[PDB]
Write a protein that binds this DNA or RNA. Structure first.
Lengths: 146, 206, 64, 58
RNA sequence: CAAUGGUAGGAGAGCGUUCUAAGGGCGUUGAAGCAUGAUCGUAAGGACAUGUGGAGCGCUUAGAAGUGAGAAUGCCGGUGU
RNA sequence: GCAGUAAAUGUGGAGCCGUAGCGAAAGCGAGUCUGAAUAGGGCGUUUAGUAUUUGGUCGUAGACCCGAAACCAGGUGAUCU
RNA sequence: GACGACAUUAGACGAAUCAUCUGGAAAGAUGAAUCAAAGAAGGUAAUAAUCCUGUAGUCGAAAAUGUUGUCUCUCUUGAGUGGAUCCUGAGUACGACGGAGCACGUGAAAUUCCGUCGGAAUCUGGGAGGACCAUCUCCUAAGGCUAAAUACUCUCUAGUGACCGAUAGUGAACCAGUACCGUGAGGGAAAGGUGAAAAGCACCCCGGAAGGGGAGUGAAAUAGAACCUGAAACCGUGUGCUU
């Protein structure tokens, strides 16, 4: 469009609300803060989660668990995610990274089963679920744990 | 999709096939607006500042005691209500430039070029072959091509002679195929592009 | 700067699939002679954070 | 007050109470005034007791 | 056909001010300011005429804000009683 | 980060979010945890997210403005007393 | 040290417009031209690409300094085999006690320092891999030097800004850290604008003077030096209608 007649997209822009400018705006004197107390003061208000001296929720409740410094968490691929290849293709972690079905291998590729194959192909990933292995084999085509 | 190629005298030499994927799309005015706005906010070097009550010289002692004088309590001579000191919320140095996704940038370029191609504001020439910088000759070239006052000339690469030949004509700006930008295209009323530049733009812009 | 995480709360909740927070139970530390068997074994479970507490503490676990 | 031979000196740290109340403190070297042979002439100077453990002839 | 009192407060639509972009304009045959008038719009507010003034300033669309004062024993000036 | 005019933009795929959840974890996985249970129950499945940005609110920053008594650090004072 | 090399501390050249109207004066308007590797900018009696200073482009150093290139100069061996013996940083490493530092609250202190006392091994050695032992892996402390990428701006040069335009912008646009205050450290103002040109009112009159009224300069003199515009409060003098 022209540089003297340009228009933003309808509903994309909105004028911001300026506070404390006259009483016809509705936010004039007290500026939307009510009258007194902390909430009216500049920098007032209270720390989030504070409950006025009542024992806060996250100290009523107990801690639980620990973090394992070495979790082997895997990038997962489901069965219906493999129908985007052809029949007889040999699919490997590098190939499915290339095809973009896996954006990063986190600690390996685990094949799981949600859809179905409807195809015949061999797979070679780091881990398999029982259902995934059986469904790979049902149509013919092997699964190598690497 | 077919644009007749003209020589600098204005006569038809040949024709070129320019794609509808770069020069025949329906312009996206929302993306085009966002691109122009980003482009024009990118040129701001906001170097504005004021002095708040800390940056203003002096004013570190309490001007008078808190009670007993009959005067309003004050704490510094440079408080914002005082004359001569303390700006509360003034301009600060900052940048005004933001980013748009890459596909949106190329869609904005394509929409600008398509808008300039549907208004019959795209003229393709074969070459320029200016062997010396001469403004008068470029002015005659533009007049023979019947171009509006505002025109953007696009070369395949940096043609030094054409650049120099068109610096001093007011309302004519020179650019390369890679140097194309939405603000410059939308400013110009007409585009005069070399065939090689047209093909390069078609390659780059999808 | 970057907003900080309430580290005490992160040691107490786990986020669920729909965005809730699973929590443990109070009264499960000692004095088990003063609670009934039903109390003790039903306090051996997990609840969620109530939505009133949720609107209070939304931002403390924003990165979880 | 440094040691003549080693360079040992005082340093600063904290005194801590059972309730972990910090109060600034000092660690002085065990410096003793002894007559040693600096460059020919005998002279009395400060030397740490550890620098005298083995190697310095009063 | 129905609804339209309203404080804390929520929501929406707008009026003005400075600056910038592009277009289109006005100015020593007199710009902005200032003054007066019996003018126009639902409000914020917009014109016109005539004096003063003696060089700059509107309009459109869109972008940014040091964007709007009657009160703070407010600050500075001027001037009263 | 490099190139570019302190632009746009081009390149840059380290990274980040999503495509799967459950469990403290090992781990299993459209399920999983508890449990002796194929029971019951908790959280989950029977697709939409992501980047930029206008508006609103929150956090860290002095955070709407003015105002203590006071605290500490380094200096200046016995020409008054 | 000796030849060059650009760069900087003065500078030089540098295109193209005339006419009429209004006006005090045009750069404005109207008409007709021209230059442009120059239409950045600032001046000129109003708003100028072509009137001036300039700009693009090109040229320029006696001298005195950065910097870089050659070639002079000044230094000087460098591999491998064996390995029987020799060396490889001691009051050190480490430990206990007390502290400090590591994102980590003397504490697991791993890793690292200080003080006080203890206090090692020498390649078949020693240290580390978050207490600690084993295995394995990696490394070789207790001597020293080291450019670049990084930080900052009292200065200097060139420029930039949806930064301020005299209560703003520095405290300070003006003889400003100055009038002024304090014994002292210290604290700290207020105050820009005639006009294009000073052409800054010759002469006459009232007046001691100050002021003024004429005359005159000027486009304008309620532009007359407190001088552009000249709001409001406030103070007056006349009146139309009222009391």
């Amino acid at each position: 469009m022209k540089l003297h007649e340009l228009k933003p997209a309808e509903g994309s822009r909105k004028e911001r609300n300026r506070v404390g400018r006259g009483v016809a705006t509705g936010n004039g004197k007290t500026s939307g803060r009510g009258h007194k107390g902390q909430k009216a003061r500049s920098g007032g208000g209270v720390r989030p989660g504070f409950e006025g001296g009542q024992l806060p929720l996250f100290r009523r409740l107990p801690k639980r668990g620990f973090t394992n410094i070495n979790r082997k968490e895997y990038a997962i691929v489901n069965l219906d995610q493999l129908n985007k290849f052809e029949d007889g293709t040999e699919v490997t972690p590098a190939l499915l990274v290339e095809s973009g079905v896996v954006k990063n291998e986190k600690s390996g590729i685990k094949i799981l089963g949600n859809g179905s194959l409807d195809k015949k192909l061999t797979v070679k990933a780091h881990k398999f679920s029982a259902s995934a292995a059986e469904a790979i084999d049902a149509k013919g085509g092997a699964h190598e744990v690497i | 999709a077919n644009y007749d190629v003209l020589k600098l005298d204005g006569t038809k030499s040949g024709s070129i096939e320019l794609s509808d994927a770069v020069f025949g799309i329906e312009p996206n005015n929302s993306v085009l607006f966002e691109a122009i706005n980003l482009q024009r906010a990118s040129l701001r070097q906001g170097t504005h500042a004021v002095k708040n009550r800390s940056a203003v010289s002096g004013g570190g002692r309490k001007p008078w005691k808190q009670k007993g004088t009959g005067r309003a309590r004050q704490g510094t001579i440079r408080a914002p209500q005082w004359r001569g000191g303390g700006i509360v919320f003034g301009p600060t140095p900052r940048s005004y430039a933001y980013k748009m996704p890459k596909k949106m940038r190329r869609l904005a370029l394509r929409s600008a070029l398509s808008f300039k191609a549907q208004e019959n504001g795209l003229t393709v020439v074969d070459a320029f072959n200016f062997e010396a910088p001469k403004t008068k000759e470029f002015k005659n070239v533009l007049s023979t091509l019947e171009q509006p006052k505002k025109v953007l000339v696009v070369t395949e690469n940096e043609d030094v002679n054409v650049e120099l030949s068109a610096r001093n004509i007011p309302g004519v700006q020179v650019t390369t195929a890679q140097g194309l930008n939405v603000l410059d295209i939308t400013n110009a009323d007409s585009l005069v592009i070399t065939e090689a530049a047209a093909k390069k733009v078609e390659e780059v812009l999808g | 700067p970057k907003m900080k995480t309430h580290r005490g709360a992160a040691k107490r909740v786990k986020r669920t699939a729909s965005g809730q927070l699973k929590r443990s139970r109070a009264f499960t530390s000692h004095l088990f002679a003063n609670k009934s068997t039903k109390q003790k074994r039903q306090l051996r479970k997990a609840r969620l954070v109530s939505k009133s507490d949720m609107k209070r503490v939304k931002q403390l676990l924003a990165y979880k | 007050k440094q040691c003549f031979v080693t360079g040992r000196k005082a340093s600063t740290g904290n005194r801590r109470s059972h309730a972990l109340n910090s109060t600034k403190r000092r660690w002085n070297a065990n410096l003793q005034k002894v007559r040693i042979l600096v460059d020919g002439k005998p002279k009395k100077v400060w030397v740490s007791a550890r620098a005298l453990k083995s190697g310095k002839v009063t």
